Amino acid sequence: LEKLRSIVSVGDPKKKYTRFEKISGTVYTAMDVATGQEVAIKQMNLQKKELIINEILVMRENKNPNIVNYLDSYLVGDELWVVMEYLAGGSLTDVVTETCMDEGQIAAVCRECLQALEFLHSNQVIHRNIKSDNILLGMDGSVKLTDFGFCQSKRSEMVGTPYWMAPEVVTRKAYGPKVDIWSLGIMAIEMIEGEPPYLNENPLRALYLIATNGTPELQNPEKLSAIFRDFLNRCLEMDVEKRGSAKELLQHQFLKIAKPLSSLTPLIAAAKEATK
Amino acid sequence: SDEEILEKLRSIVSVGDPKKKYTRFEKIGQGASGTVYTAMDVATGQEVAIKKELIINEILVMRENKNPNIVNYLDSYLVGDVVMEYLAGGSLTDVVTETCMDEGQIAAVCRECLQALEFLHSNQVIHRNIKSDNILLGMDGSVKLTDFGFCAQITPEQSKRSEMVGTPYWMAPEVVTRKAYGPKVDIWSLGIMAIEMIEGEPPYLNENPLRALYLIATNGTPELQNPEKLSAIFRDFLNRCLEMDVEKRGSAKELLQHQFLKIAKPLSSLTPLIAAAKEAT
Ligand SMILES: CCCCOc1ccc(-c2cc3cnc(NC)nc3n(CCCN)c2=O)c(C)c1
Ligand SMILES: CCCCOc1ccc(-c2cc3cnc(NC)nc3n(CCCN)c2=O)c(C)c1
């Protein structure tokens, strides 16, 4: 608990933040009273402690501009408050479902996600859940990853479809950083198709297809540019050794058609207007 | 309309105060999903356990298919953003993994489950997820079936399904291979549950879920590790549950008449197993 006292901040967070709106514990949106910065606050009743504290410690040291970044934490009575930056642009999922992203906007998102993965993979972190729900957007078009850990019963039934998982993860083989690269390729296909790859398809059937067919089938490849399809083929190489690393793919030609991140801002406005 | 499906779910349940009908709320062993508790009917003292398209189907299925061999749904409440009967003896998984049941004890459990399946199948409800984990036991030794989240309702106009739903290790061959299938996939899954009672585990549990599916598609009827330890009559009952030929596989009605079930012990014989399982926990 003395290390818990080494991470918590001095202050009453009820005084430093206002406009608490509710949206492993509850999640509020709030606003820094002194600067007006929007924040997201997660509240957790401590009474698997030791993991929570270790994670807080590694978050605060390994900041990165393409990761939803920790701000502070507070010991509030019996519960721990963890304060993150709030990204008000919403999730990539909303953008993907309400707009048709062009390849330039896709390349931009892919570059930003690959920068995050290079950072994480250099510190030996595996995200394991690279997918559109876990990509948050800022109102200036920033792109940041969320919902992963810095630090699954065979008897249980599958809910729902794990469409983002690499073949080596579905076969429950030990796996490494390249599973994120597979997931990113799936997400790029989702962006251009407007839907996750496996709908109308049962989870166990999807599991078998991921394991057997592997490199996912896309509708009408002739819709894609040759360089986008090459990029997808580098990401979705069933052979792990051949599959590109984050560092290698940051060099890929497809990323050089990326539009400025401001090009994402009209997509955000369109998504917000549609919901509702 | 992804909000019309929610609106339908709310309409199917009524608004009232649960805390004004049940008391003594206590967070029981919640798991993956969570929010499982125990309570006490204020008026009668009855002990209860309280926890979108699929949720709707399951609630509906439960309300219209009540039976002594099914964990009875008691009431539903809507407050802001499911009462069931409580079976203090725990799951059959705790028994099969921590104890060695004898043939009389196995036959008794199989009969109660076959009684459950005869009732569902005659009401055209296929469970599709039979396994020891969905068998709950009373402190008097009663055996009840739960979890209708995967169940299919069939008709004479559509009597078959083709969907890979269930839990791999227990799935029938015709489900794994996406052939049209009917109520007898539950019979197969009961036979796998009998193997659980014999060996402690369904076949291939050491394999991975996907490897296990391929092995079911390619082996068909699984092999007991030690068949010679079973009476020929138990061996026979098992063989009619795990028949590859759906036509030759026994129905719930036909298997309730099997001779293996004649050696069943009374349900009181299961309470020593429950005590062993609790102790083993
Ligand atoms: C266990 C210690 C690790 C840190 O623990 C947290 C992780 C993430 C978040 C979060 C950030 C966030 C930022 N921006 C937006 N904008 C929509 N939302 C956010 N959310 C809501 C769900 C995001 N999928 C969060 O939960 C929060 C509040 C806490
Ligand atoms: C999502 C669809 C609605 C679900 O509707 C329910 C289904 C099952 C149960 C349940 C009963 C129960 C009875 N008795 C005991 N004995 C301890 N436990 C029970 N549990 C705990 C897990 C059992 N595997 C339950 O979840 C409950 C409480 C609700």
User: Could you identify the residue written with the tokens 């997509």?
Assistant: A267
For residue A91, the SS3 value is: strand
| Residues A108, B223: Cα–Cα separation, whole Å | 55
Chain B residue at shortest CA distance from A170? B210
For residue A196, the SS3 value is: coil
Same domain, B276 and B184: yes
Alpha-carbon distance values, B175 to A199, A205, A206, A223, B214 (Å): 19, 11, 15, 36, 12
Residue type, B168: P
- Tell me whether A257 touches chain B (CB under 8 Å): no
Distance of CA A13 to the CA centre of its chain: 27
Give a three-class secondary structure readout of A16-45. HEEEEEECCCEEEEEEECCCCCEEEEEEEE
Distance of CA A25 to the CA centre of its chain: 19
CA of A181 to the centre of ligand 2 (A): 39
∠ at Cα B238 (B261, A157), nearest 5°? 105
Q: Quick check: B54 and B19 in contact, CB under 8 A?
A: no
Neighbouring C-alpha atoms within 13 Å toward the C-beta of A62: 20
Same domain, B64 and B201: no
Question: What is the least distance, in Å, from the CA of B183 to any CA of chain A?
Answer: 20
Supply B246's token pair. 């759906």
Q: Whose CA is nearest to atom 1 of ligand 2?
A: B55
Q: For A31, phi and psi rounded to 5 degrees? A: -140, 130
Alpha-helical runs (H) found in chain B: 4-12, 53-63, 92-98, 103-122, 173-176, 185-199, 209-219, 232-241, 252-255, 271-280
Task: Identify the domain boundary among B57, B85, B113.
Answer: B85
The DSSP secondary-structure symbol of A175 reads -
Same domain, B155 and B226: yes
Task: Identify the domain boundary among B85, B120, B145.
Answer: B85
Same domain, A110 and A68: no
Same domain, A203 and A80: no
Pocket test for ligand 2, best of B71, B76, B87, B151 (most atoms within 8 A of CB): B71
| Residues A219, A209: Cα–Cα separation, whole Å | 16
The count of other CB atoms within 10 Å of the CB of residue B109 is 27
- Experimental determination technique: X-ray
Secondary element (H or E) of residue A5: helix A4-7
Task: Identify the domain boundary among B68, B85, B102.
Answer: B85
| Residues A108, A119: Cα–Cα separation, whole Å | 17
Same domain, A147 and A23: no
Q: Whose CA is nearest to atom 5 of ligand 2?
A: B82
User: Could you identify the residue written with the tokens 């705790």?
Assistant: B94
Q: Quick check: A68 and A120 in contact, CB under 8 A?
A: no
Residue type, B260: F
Of B112, B104, B101, B170, nearest in space to B137 by CA: B112
Buried b (16+ CB within 10 A) or exposed e, A166-205: bbbbbbeeebebbbbbbbbbbbbbbbbeeebbbeeebbbb
Alpha-carbon distance values, A30 to A19, A39, A135, A140, B31 (Å): 5, 5, 20, 20, 31
Give the range of the structural domain holding residue A67, as residue numbers without chain letter. 4-85
Number of domains making up chain B: 2
Resolution (A): 2.2
Question: What are the residues whose beta carbons fall under 8 Å from the beta carbon of A11, sequence distance 6 or more?
Answer: A74
Same domain, B30 and B64: yes
Residue type, A181: I
Q: Quick check: B154 and B148 in contact, CB under 8 A?
A: no
Neighbouring C-alpha atoms within 13 Å toward the C-beta of B101: 32
CATH of the domain at A72: 3.30.200.20
B265: left (phi over 0), alpha (psi -120 to 50) or beta: beta
Residue type, B259: Q
Same domain, B109 and B244: yes
Same domain, A123 and A151: yes
Same domain, A110 and A224: yes
| Residues B127, B152: Cα–Cα separation, whole Å | 7
Same domain, A81 and A96: no
Same domain, A105 and A217: yes
CATH of the domain at B260: 1.10.510.10
Of B72, B52, B54, B53, nearest in space to B62 by CA: B72
